[PDB]
Coordinates of all heavy atoms in Angstrom, one line a residue:
Chain P
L57 N 0.9 72.3 14.5 CA 0.1 73.5 14.4 C -1.4 73.2 14.3 O -2.2 74.1 14.0 CB 0.5 74.2 13.0 CG 2.0 74.7 13.0 CD1 2.3 75.2 11.6 CD2 2.3 75.7 14.0
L58 N -1.8 71.9 14.7 CA -3.2 71.5 14.5 C -4.2 72.2 15.4 O -5.3 72.6 14.9 CB -3.2 70.0 14.8 CG -4.6 69.3 14.4 CD1 -5.0 69.5 13.0 CD2 -4.5 67.8 14.8
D59 N -3.9 72.4 16.7 CA -4.7 73.2 17.7 C -4.9 74.6 17.2 O -6.0 75.2 17.3 CB -3.9 73.2 19.0 CG -3.4 71.8 19.5 OD1 -2.7 71.2 18.7 OD2 -3.8 71.4 20.6
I60 N -3.9 75.2 16.7 CA -3.9 76.6 16.2 C -4.7 76.7 14.9 O -5.5 77.7 14.8 CB -2.5 77.1 15.9 CG1 -1.5 76.8 17.2 CG2 -2.5 78.6 15.6 CD1 -0.1 77.1 16.9
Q61 N -4.5 75.8 14.0 CA -5.1 75.9 12.6 C -6.4 75.2 12.5 O -7.0 75.1 11.4 CB -4.1 75.4 11.6 CG -2.9 76.4 11.5 CD -3.2 77.5 10.5 OE1 -3.1 77.3 9.3 NE2 -3.7 78.6 11.0
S62 N -7.0 74.7 13.6 CA -8.4 74.3 13.7 C -9.2 75.4 14.5 O -10.4 75.3 14.7 CB -8.6 72.9 14.4 OG -7.9 72.9 15.7
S63 N -8.5 76.5 14.8 CA -9.1 77.6 15.5 C -9.1 78.9 14.7 O -8.1 79.3 14.2 CB -8.4 77.9 16.9 OG -9.0 78.9 17.6
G64 N -10.3 79.5 14.5 CA -10.4 80.7 13.8 C -10.0 82.0 14.6 O -10.1 83.1 14.1
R65 N -9.6 81.8 15.8 CA -9.4 82.9 16.8 C -8.0 83.3 17.0 O -7.6 83.9 18.0 CB -10.0 82.4 18.2 CG -11.5 81.8 18.1 CD -12.5 82.7 17.3 NE -12.7 83.9 18.1 CZ -13.6 84.2 19.0 NH1 -14.4 83.3 19.4 NH2 -13.7 85.5 19.4
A66 N -7.0 82.9 16.1 CA -5.6 83.1 16.2 C -5.3 84.6 16.2 O -4.3 85.1 16.8 CB -4.9 82.4 15.0
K67 N -6.1 85.5 15.4 CA -5.9 86.9 15.3 C -6.1 87.6 16.7 O -5.3 88.5 17.1 CB -6.8 87.4 14.2 CG -6.3 88.6 13.3 CD -5.0 88.3 12.6 CE -4.7 89.3 11.5 NZ -3.2 89.3 11.2
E68 N -7.1 87.2 17.5 CA -7.3 87.6 18.9 C -6.2 87.3 19.8 O -5.8 88.2 20.7 CB -8.6 87.0 19.5 CG -9.9 87.4 18.8 CD -10.4 86.6 17.6 OE1 -9.6 86.2 16.7 OE2 -11.6 86.3 17.6
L69 N -5.5 86.2 19.7 CA -4.4 85.8 20.5 C -3.2 86.8 20.5 O -2.6 87.1 21.5 CB -3.8 84.4 20.2 CG -4.9 83.3 20.4 CD1 -4.3 81.9 19.9 CD2 -5.3 83.1 21.8
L70 N -2.9 87.4 19.3 CA -1.9 88.5 19.2 C -2.5 89.9 19.4 O -1.8 90.9 19.2 CB -1.3 88.4 17.8 CG -0.6 87.1 17.3 CD1 -0.1 87.3 15.9 CD2 0.5 86.7 18.3
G71 N -3.7 90.0 20.0 CA -4.3 91.3 20.2 C -5.0 92.0 19.1 O -5.4 93.1 19.1
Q72 N -5.0 91.3 17.9 CA -5.4 91.9 16.6 C -6.9 91.6 16.4 O -7.4 91.7 15.2 CB -4.5 91.3 15.5 CG -3.0 91.6 15.7 CD -2.2 90.9 14.6 OE1 -2.6 90.4 13.6 NE2 -0.8 91.0 14.8
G73 N -7.7 91.3 17.4 CA -9.1 91.1 17.4 C -10.0 92.3 17.2 O -9.7 93.4 17.8
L74 N -11.1 92.2 16.5 CA -12.1 93.3 16.3 C -13.3 92.9 17.1 O -13.6 91.7 17.4 CB -12.5 93.4 14.8 CG -11.4 93.9 13.9 CD1 -11.9 93.8 12.4 CD2 -10.9 95.3 14.2
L75 N -14.2 93.9 17.4 CA -15.4 93.7 18.3 C -16.6 93.2 17.6 O -17.7 93.0 18.2 CB -15.7 95.1 18.9 CG -14.6 95.7 19.7 CD1 -15.0 97.2 20.1 CD2 -14.2 94.9 21.0
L76 N -16.5 93.1 16.2 CA -17.5 92.3 15.5 C -16.7 91.7 14.4 O -16.0 92.3 13.5 CB -18.6 93.2 14.9 CG -19.9 92.5 14.4 CD1 -21.0 93.5 14.3 CD2 -19.7 91.8 13.1
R77 N -16.6 90.3 14.3 CA -16.0 89.6 13.3 C -16.4 88.1 13.2 O -15.9 87.4 12.3 CB -14.4 89.6 13.4 CG -14.0 89.1 14.8 CD -12.4 88.9 14.9 NE -12.1 87.5 15.2 CZ -11.9 86.5 14.3 NH1 -12.5 86.6 13.1 NH2 -11.2 85.5 14.7
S78 N -17.3 87.7 14.1 CA -18.2 86.6 13.8 C -19.6 87.1 14.3 O -20.4 87.6 13.5 CB -17.8 85.2 14.4 OG -17.8 85.1 15.8
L79 N -19.8 87.0 15.6 CA -21.0 87.6 16.3 C -20.8 87.7 17.8 O -21.6 88.2 18.5 CB -22.3 86.9 16.0 CG -22.5 85.5 16.6 CD1 -24.0 85.1 16.4 CD2 -21.6 84.4 16.1
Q80 N -19.6 87.2 18.3 CA -19.5 86.9 19.7 C -18.7 87.9 20.5 O -18.8 88.0 21.8 CB -18.8 85.5 19.8 CG -18.6 84.9 21.2 CD -17.8 83.6 21.2 OE1 -16.6 83.6 21.0 NE2 -18.5 82.5 21.3
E81 N -17.9 88.7 19.8 CA -16.7 89.4 20.3 C -17.0 90.7 21.2 O -16.7 91.8 20.8 CB -15.8 89.8 19.1 CG -15.5 88.7 18.2 CD -16.6 88.1 17.3 OE1 -17.3 88.9 16.6 OE2 -16.8 86.9 17.3
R82 N -17.5 90.5 22.4 CA -17.9 91.6 23.2 C -17.7 91.3 24.7 O -17.7 90.2 25.2 CB -19.4 92.0 23.0 CG -19.6 92.8 21.7 CD -21.0 93.1 21.3 NE -21.8 91.9 21.3 CZ -21.7 90.9 20.4 NH1 -20.9 91.0 19.3 NH2 -22.4 89.8 20.5
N83 N -17.6 92.3 25.6 CA -17.7 93.8 25.3 C -16.4 94.5 25.4 O -15.3 93.9 25.8 CB -18.7 94.5 26.3 CG -19.7 95.4 25.5 OD1 -20.4 94.9 24.6 ND2 -19.6 96.7 25.7
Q84 N -16.3 95.7 24.8 CA -15.2 96.5 24.7 C -14.5 96.8 26.0 O -13.2 96.9 26.1 CB -15.7 97.9 24.1 CG -14.5 98.9 23.7 CD -15.1 100.3 23.5 OE1 -14.6 101.0 22.5 NE2 -16.0 100.8 24.3
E85 N -15.2 96.9 27.1 CA -14.8 97.2 28.5 C -13.9 96.1 29.0 O -12.8 96.4 29.6 CB -16.1 97.3 29.3 CG -16.8 98.7 29.1 CD -17.1 99.0 27.6 OE1 -17.7 98.2 26.9 OE2 -16.5 100.1 27.2
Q86 N -14.2 94.8 28.7 CA -13.3 93.7 29.0 C -12.1 93.7 28.0 O -10.9 93.5 28.5 CB -14.0 92.3 28.8 CG -15.2 92.1 29.8 CD -16.6 92.5 29.1 OE1 -16.8 93.7 28.7 NE2 -17.5 91.6 29.0
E87 N -12.3 93.9 26.7 CA -11.2 94.0 25.7 C -10.1 95.0 26.0 O -9.0 94.9 25.6 CB -11.9 94.3 24.4 CG -12.7 93.1 23.8 CD -11.9 92.2 22.9 OE1 -11.0 91.5 23.5 OE2 -12.0 92.3 21.7
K88 N -10.5 96.1 26.7 CA -9.5 97.1 27.2 C -8.5 96.5 28.2 O -7.3 96.9 28.2 CB -10.2 98.3 28.0 CG -11.0 99.2 27.0 CD -12.0 100.1 27.8 CE -13.2 100.5 26.9 NZ -14.3 101.2 27.8
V89 N -8.8 95.5 29.0 CA -7.9 94.7 29.8 C -7.1 93.8 28.9 O -5.8 93.8 29.0 CB -8.6 93.9 30.8 CG1 -7.6 93.1 31.7 CG2 -9.5 94.8 31.7
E90 N -7.7 93.1 28.0 CA -7.1 92.1 27.1 C -6.0 92.7 26.1 O -4.9 92.2 25.9 CB -8.2 91.3 26.3 CG -9.2 90.6 27.2 CD -8.6 89.6 28.1 OE1 -8.3 88.5 27.7 OE2 -8.2 90.0 29.3
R91 N -6.3 93.9 25.5 CA -5.4 94.6 24.7 C -4.3 95.3 25.5 O -3.2 95.7 24.9 CB -6.1 95.7 23.9 CG -7.1 95.2 22.9 CD -6.6 94.1 21.9 NE -7.7 93.7 21.0 CZ -8.7 92.9 21.4 NH1 -8.7 92.4 22.6 NH2 -9.7 92.6 20.5

Side-chain angles (χ1 to χ4, degrees):
Chain P
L57 298 173
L58 189 58
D59 309 59
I60 311 173
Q61 289 277 276
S62 51
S63 185
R65 313 306 298 263
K67 216 57 165 157
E68 294 91 311
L69 298 174
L70 300 180
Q72 302 175 7
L74 297 171
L75 302 171
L76 197 163
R77 56 173 239 87
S78 70
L79 72 171
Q80 183 182 78
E81 305 74 50
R82 281 178 307 291
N83 227 64
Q84 185 194 221
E85 289 46 57
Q86 303 93 299
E87 290 269 72
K88 292 163 205 172
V89 184
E90 304 300 281
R91 298 304 179 284

